[PDB]
Symmetry: C3
Subunit: 88 residues, 3 copies
Amino acid sequence: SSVQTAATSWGTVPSIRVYTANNGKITERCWDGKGWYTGAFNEPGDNVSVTSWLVGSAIHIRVYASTGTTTTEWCWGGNGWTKSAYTA
Amino acid sequence: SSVQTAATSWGTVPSIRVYTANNGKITERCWDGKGWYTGAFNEPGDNVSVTSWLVGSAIHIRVYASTGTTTTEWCWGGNGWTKSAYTAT
Amino acid sequence: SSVQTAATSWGTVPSIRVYTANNGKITERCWDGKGWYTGAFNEPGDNVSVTSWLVGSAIHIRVYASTGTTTTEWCWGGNGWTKSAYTAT
Ligand SMILES: C[C@@H]1O[C@@H](O[C@H]2[C@H](O[C@@H]3[C@@H](O)[C@H](O)CO[C@@H]3O)O[C@H](CO)[C@H](O)[C@@H]2O)[C@@H](O)[C@H](O)[C@@H]1O
Ligand SMILES: C[C@@H]1O[C@@H](O[C@H]2[C@H](O[C@@H]3[C@@H](O)[C@H](O)CO[C@@H]3O)O[C@H](CO)[C@H](O)[C@@H]2O)[C@@H](O)[C@H](O)[C@@H]1O
Ligand SMILES: C[C@@H]1O[C@@H](O[C@H]2[C@H](O[C@@H]3[C@@H](O)[C@H](O)CO[C@@H]3O)O[C@H](CO)[C@H](O)[C@@H]2O)[C@@H](O)[C@H](O)[C@@H]1O
Ligand SMILES: C[C@@H]1O[C@@H](O)[C@@H](O)[C@H](O)[C@@H]1O
Ligand SMILES: C[C@@H]1O[C@@H](O)[C@@H](O)[C@H](O)[C@@H]1O
Ligand SMILES: C[C@@H]1O[C@@H](O)[C@@H](O)[C@H](O)[C@@H]1O
């Protein structure tokens, strides 16, 4: 068995976010040009994927966290992480 | 066990496509700014990844669907999904 | 069981790189507009993800290769692949 990761990046610095599903929990490591740090994202899941887009200089991120057949969408728009009503 | 997903997005609306491998079948959920809907993509696979690029406002998508060691490339270019001749190795 | 892939792309040609974890080894298939070929990337891993960004016309790629709880970051910036000091948590 191994952990399962997902990655996204933006700009040219770059900024990078790496998500890791490990024993039913997803955590986040972050690079903004000056070291890797532990990010605010921490939610349940056995599987993770991610996508992101910029609106001007502001990053928007969607993290799809799945356990069993249930997928939860987590949303970042600059002010914290919230789960949406997204339902597979 | 759990399902396995892959996601891609484009533009600033944005549009998002989320692919889910579940019991050997990959399906697709779609967002173009006005609700989530079930997409046209439905193909066999135990594993899925995706990438996409824009040419102007036209989206192009490649979905890599795997079973065993066999990886099949599915292509969207505005007018349906088609399997390419892509092979692993 | 099945292989596990990750994909990235850039520009409008486009270029595409597909990474596959297969029996503890990750390999790479490449498209630059003129056929699929086996890429330089070949490293151990049971799981792979990837991201890339352009700086002008130069592609930069990070591949995250995991075995157990150990994740290795492999870096391409035009001159070959090297591992960084990236350590999970
Ligand atoms: C996208 C977001 O990134 C981190 O959020 C932290 C936020 O970090 C960033 C900032 O340092 C960077 O240079 C550019 O933008 C980002 O938003 O910074 C604030 C403090 O200003 C907090 O530390 C945020 O946690 C992650 O922690 C988030 O989970 C998310 O990935
Ligand atoms: C990329 C494509 O998206 C869906 O295709 C549907 C298509 O949707 C899109 C459109 O509504 C959007 O605003 C921009 O581009 C797309 O083409 O719209 C037609 C009706 O106009 C059908 O609904 C298509 O199914 C998915 O269903 C496809 O699988 C694919 O992801
Ligand atoms: C990004 C890189 O791509 C391959 O590297 C090969 C390199 O390929 C590219 C070139 O042919 C293309 O038109 C645009 O840029 C790329 O860098 O070409 C050199 C010799 O010219 C070698 O063939 C490199 O191997 C992969 O092999 C790398 O692993 C990586 O994905
Ligand atoms: C881009 C969209 O952002 C919000 O409206 C979310 O609630 C949606 O589920 C989608 O991710
Ligand atoms: C970008 C390229 O598009 C088509 O030519 C496909 O047949 C290739 O396999 C590749 O995806
Ligand atoms: C963008 C950064 O590039 C190098 O500095 C690496 O050592 C980092 O881990 C990161 O990927």
